[PDB]
From a paper:
Coiled-coils are important protein–protein interaction motifs present in ∼3% of all eukaryotic proteins. They consist of two or more amphipathic α-helices that wrap around each other’s hydrophobic seams resulting in parallel or antiparallel filamentous supercoils. Here, we present a case study for the phase determination of coiled-coil structures using a combination of native or engineered cysteine crosslinking together with native SAD phasing. In conclusion, our case study shows that cysteine crosslinking and phasing via sulfur-SAD is a particular useful strategy to solve coiled-coil structures by X-ray crystallography.
As a second case, we used the regulatory coiled-coil domain of the human kinesin-4 motor protein KIF21A. A recent study showed that the minimal KIF21A regulatory region folds into an intramolecular antiparallel coiled-coil monomer in solution, but crystallized into a dimeric domain-swapped antiparallel coiled-coil. Here, we aimed to stabilize and crystallize the native, monomeric coiled-coil form of the KIF21A regulatory region by rationally introducing cysteine residues (the construct is hereafter referred to as Kif21a_M947C). In the second case, Kif21a_M947C, we recombinantly introduced a cysteine residue to stabilize and crystallize the native, monomeric coiled-coil from the KIF21A regulatory region. A schematic representation of the KIF21A intramolecular antiparallel coiled-coil (amino acids 938–1017) is provided in Figure 2A, illustrating that a native cysteine, Cys1006, is present in a heptad repeat d core position. We therefore introduced the cysteine mutation in the juxtaposed heptad acore position of the coiled-coil to allow for disulfide bridge formation. The stability of Kif21a_M947C was assessed by thermal unfolding profiles monitored by CD at 222 nm, which yielded a Tm value of 37°C under reducing and 69°C under oxidizing conditions. As expected Kif21a_M947C was found to be monomeric under both reducing and oxidizing conditions (measured molecular mass: 11.3 kDa; calculated molecular mass: 9.5 kDa). The Kif21a_M947C coiled-coil fragment was crystallized under oxidizing buffer conditions. The final structure is composed of two intramolecular antiparallel coiled-coils per asymmetric unit with a disulfide bond between Cys947 and Cys1006. The results revealed the classical knobs into holes packing mode with the pairing of heptad a and d positions forming d/a mixed layers typical of antiparallel coiled-coils.
Residue numbers in the entry: 2 to 40, 46 to 81
Amino acid sequence: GSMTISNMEADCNRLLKQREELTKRREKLSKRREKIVKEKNVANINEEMESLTANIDYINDSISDCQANIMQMEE
């Protein structure tokens, strides 16, 4: 349709917000863990930061896939 490509763009770009939110969340845990080891319970932070990283990497693959499909749609 007329807005099909525009909608694809908007939907693919929602992935950027996922990445941003997860990146900051991972950063919040980094500065938090840094203070604890400076002064334990970092194992829980390590487990979550590693989860966030795996999801950030997943999103990055999704961005490449999504943008590639747009390129094919536009060719």
